[PDB]
Structures are given as C-alpha cells and as structure tokens.
C-alpha cells in the first residue's frame, strides 16, 4: 500500500546511473567490495574521470550501510570523497560515485621495483599526506583496519595533481604483531604500524616484512628477522597477549641476536643517523603503547628538514607511471 502519485513522481525524477554516466567496459577493478569502473558524464558538462563503484551483493548490506554512513560525513583532502549515491530500484544494486585516482602506491612501488632490473621529496610528501589523512580519521574515532599500498591512492593530472587519497577496498605484511598474537580489538596504533611498513617500503622499494585463527608463525619469524626479538622491557604486556605461550613455545630470543632495524636499513642503503630513520623506528615500535601517534608523527623534525613536503607529491614533474588498464 504505497501512493501511486508519490511513486511515479519519484521514479520520474530519480537520476539513474546508466543515463548520467558512460562506463560500459571500463572495469578498473574487481574484488570483495564489488566492481569499480572509470566513468565519464554523458551530458558533457564535466570532462574529469570519476570512479564508479557497484557494491557486491544486493540491497542495503551491512557493509554497504557502514560505507555510506561514514563517507557521507567524512570530508578531508587526503581521504577519498563520496560524490553521489545511486539506488537502482529494479535490481536493488547500490552505486557509489568517487573522484578518479589514476595511481596508487602498489603500482608506483612495483614500477620502481621493476626499474631495478624513488625520489625522497616524493617519499616525505607521500608519508606526510598519509599521516594527515589518518589523523583526521583517528580524530573522528574512525579506524582504517587494513592500511597497505593498494589502499593509498594518488591523483593523476587535474586540479588535485599528485594528492594522496586514502581509500579502502590475503597477506599479513602490514599487520601489527599484537594482531598476530591474537589481539581482540583494532586500534589506532595498529594503523600506525601499517604506515611504518609503508614508509619502510617507500624508502627501500621492498616490503619490510615480506612473507608467504589469528596466529601466523612465519609472519612473526620475518618481523623478528628484521626487528629482533623484543625484550621484556621493550614490551611488558606481551605476556597478556592470548598467544604468548604459543610464541614462547615456537620461538627463542637467541635466534635473532644479530637482528635490528638499524642493521636491516643499512643493507638497503638508508643511514641510521638520518631524521627519516628515527621517525621510522618510532612508527615501527613493537609495543602498541610505545608507538607515536599520527599527530606526533606529523610534528617530527623530519618534515622541517630539506626538502620540505609538497601538496603535489610529484612536485610539478612529468609523471612516468602508466595509467590504469581496463579489465
């Protein structure tokens, strides 16, 4: 029992995504999230590319309901922006319109990784904008819970040239050691560890903890191979982690005696007495309560040292990275 005049009036007025946008065979990505398309306005009062996400499943899912709820309130230059929501009544599919990010850190790093067989003005700028975006979210009690290069987008040519855009779409490379020891809850510290891993990856072009129930032995073994096994003094409440007895069963301090972040970063040509390393060490702290916060990280003298970070991460240069291939 719904009013007919009300029904036909809305149906008449309702903007349909197929009518407004051209996206046929422009599928930029598929995943858990759903399908993402590089789109353009058909009624050409706009020539910027837009990212257009059809959500996985039907109807207003639990996932779909949270994404819409949060992004509709969020506004910050280093966090991805929701432009419009289309509710397609026929098939009950939900569409989400975003601005289009040409690049991301997964591809940028892989490109430099291929270039062997990464400018430090860019690195500092990348890190700063990541920390600025997370500080905004953390301030609003919004955790990311899955930070990694692929989720750190970077805008291509346009009015937002080279601005970082934090986004959110089976590897444990960026996962903090407390989660690996069975931490019940996500935290702001867990996001900071992942930022530390990324910053290590930006400097070296290598994932610092590369590898491959909550417990994961070989991933822990890699962390200790790089960081060293932590002293009781370094992380006191490690004893209170649910998987501490399993850790003590499987691992021995003696194994990682000649291991440190200093020794690791020397092997990948980064000086241990640089302001960049001392910040990295403060981000990659084993004890969650001994990691600096995103606000504190932004206040590090590293960002006052030459070269200063820039709004355009690319610093006005020609961009050597290739555009997104369609799927």
């Amino acid at each position: 029992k719904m009013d007919y005049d009300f029904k036909v009036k809305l149906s008449s007025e309702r903007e349909r995504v197929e009518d407004l946008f051209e996206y046929e065979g422009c599928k930029v990505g598929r995943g858990t999230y759903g399908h993402v398309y590089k789109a353009k306005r058909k009624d050409g009062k706009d020539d910027k590319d837009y990212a257009l996400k059809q959500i996985e499943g039907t109807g207003i899912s639990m996932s779909a309901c949270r994404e819409i709820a949060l992004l509709r309130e969020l506004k910050h230059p280093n966090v991805i922006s929701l432009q419009k929501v289309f509710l397609s009544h026929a098939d009950r599919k939900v569409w989400l319109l975003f601005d289009y990010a040409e690049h991301d850190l997964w591809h940028i790093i892989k490109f430099h990784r291929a270039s062997k067989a990464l400018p430090r003005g860019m690195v500092k700028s990348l890190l700063y904008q990541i920390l600025d975006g997370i500080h905004y979210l953390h301030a609003n009690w919004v955790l990311h819970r899955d930070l990694k290069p692929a989720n750190i987008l970077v805008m291509g040519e346009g009015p937002e040239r080279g601005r970082v855009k934090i986004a959110d779409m089976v590897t444990f490379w960026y996962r903090a050691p407390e989660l690996l020891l069975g931490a019940r809850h996500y935290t702001k510290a867990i996001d900071i560890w992942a930022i530390g891993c990324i910053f290590a990856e930006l400097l070296t072009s290598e994932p610092i903890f590369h590898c491959r129930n909550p417990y994961h032995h070989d991933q822990l073994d890699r962390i200790f191979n790089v960081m060293g096994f932590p002293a009781d003094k370094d992380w006191e409440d490690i004893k209170k982690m649910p998987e501490h007895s399993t850790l003590m069963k499987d691992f021995r301090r003696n194994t990682y005696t000649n291991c440190s972040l200093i020794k690791y970063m020397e092997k990948h040509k980064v000086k241990p007495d640089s302001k960049a390393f001392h910040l990295l060490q403060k981000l990659l702290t084993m004890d969650p309560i001994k990691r600096i916060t995103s606000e504190q990280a932004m206040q590090d003298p590293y960002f006052l040292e030459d070269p200063l970070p820039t709004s355009d991460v690319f610093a006005g240069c020609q961009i050597p990275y290739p555009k997104r291939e369609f799927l």
């Binding site: 029992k1 719904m2 009013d3 007919y4 005049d5 009300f6 949270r66 819409i68 609003n140």
Partner: protein
Amino acid sequence: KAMAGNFWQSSHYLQWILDKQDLLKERQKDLKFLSEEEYWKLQIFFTNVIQALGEHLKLRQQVIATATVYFKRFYARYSLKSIDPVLMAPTCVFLASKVEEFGVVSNTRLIAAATSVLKTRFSYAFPKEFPYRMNHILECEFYLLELMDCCLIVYHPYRPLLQYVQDMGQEDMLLPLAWRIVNDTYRTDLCLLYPPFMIALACLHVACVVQQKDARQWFAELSVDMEKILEIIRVILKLYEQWKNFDERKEMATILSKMPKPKPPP
C-alpha cells in the same frame, strides 16, 4: 564513538536542522485531513510504536532514537499517504539497527516482532494483523534511504547530557529523570529544530526544577543562547500537559481512520 565531535560539520547539522516555518508549511498538506492536535497525537503514537519495536528486539536506546529521527525526517517533508507509517516504523528500526552496528536483524525476527508488538500492545488501534512481509520492508528501506539523502549518522542528547551532569557532580540525583525527559522530547519536533546539546540542557533544567535543585550559578556560567533553551523548556512543559489530556487508547482508532490513505494505481 565514530564522528563524536563532528556535529558542526555533520550532515545532521548542515541539512537536518530545519526551519520551523518550512516544516509547518509542508504539514498543511496533511492538516486538510487532520487537526493540529490530531497530527501531534499521531507523532506521539508512532513514537510509542517505534519504542515498543526496539524493546521487543532488545535494542539499545540510542538505536531507537536514531530510528525515531529517520521516521520524523521522512514525514517532515512527505505526506502520511505516501508510505504507510505502519510499514515505515519497523523499516526505520531495521535501517537504524544496521547503522549503529548491532547487526542485520533477521527477516523472521523483524516480521515476528512487528506482528507481535501490534497484536499485543496496540490492538486498540490496529484490529487486523500486520499485513506486510519482508519484501515490503526492503522496498521501503530504499525510499527511506533516498529521501534522507543517505544521511545515516544522527547525534542525540544522551551524550551531552551525560557530560553535563558529570560536570555538575549530580549524576545519581539528576541523571535518571533528565535522561527520562530526553526520551519524552522525541514525542515533539524538538530534535528537528535544535542541536542535541541544547535539548539536553533543557531536560537537565526541568529535572532540576522538578527535584528542587538550585543550578543557576552553573547554568549562568555556560556560553549558550539562553533564550533558545527557554523555547525548548516551554515545549517540554507543554508536552506533559498534552500527555495529561491525551488518552491514546480511547482516541487513536478514530485518528488513524482520519489519516489520508494511499491512492492505489489505475
């Protein structure tokens, strides 16, 4: 906790604090069929229905408040004929339950709860059984989400109230009643017209007057538009007078018949 201190940048504040004259002008559509008095009695009735649904589903009071705002927002702009409020009420609870991260209430659990609450606690108004099925809910959810402009996060007075009484150090004496008066304001238009903190202060003032606690020195020290609080207080006092004179159980069958029913298709 998410977006806690973002009210002045939020979609609630920027889009869903409405002008009273804009609100009353849109209401004149429905006032052809109903009295001003009778329209208010519908608001109170469906506020109780939504409360009863949330209680039956063991939902927290903040989830219930959010659902009540969604309901209020929908009919603030649109007519009572457009969608049946009997359908909209449980749809609002269903949508709010997802947003506030309790869970997707089961299809069977929602429709049983909607059937049971009306059969048990509202048989005086509704003689016939709850006719709608889960496909009607899922359709209605799309219309609701669209009209609210995807604005799902809603701020409520329970948080600022809590902070205010802790500042006073009168949590044990004042919090129960003041919290209880915050619940009653959802009978009125107040949450569409004022920020949550302003309602909370008004409720706290009435709790002080009722229990004969002096807090003028406390209230005078606050940096708020104090005349705007006296508007909210006057609405709260007027509310309890309507309560006294309103017999929901004897009146609502006749008021619900006077509602404009939806036009079916040709």
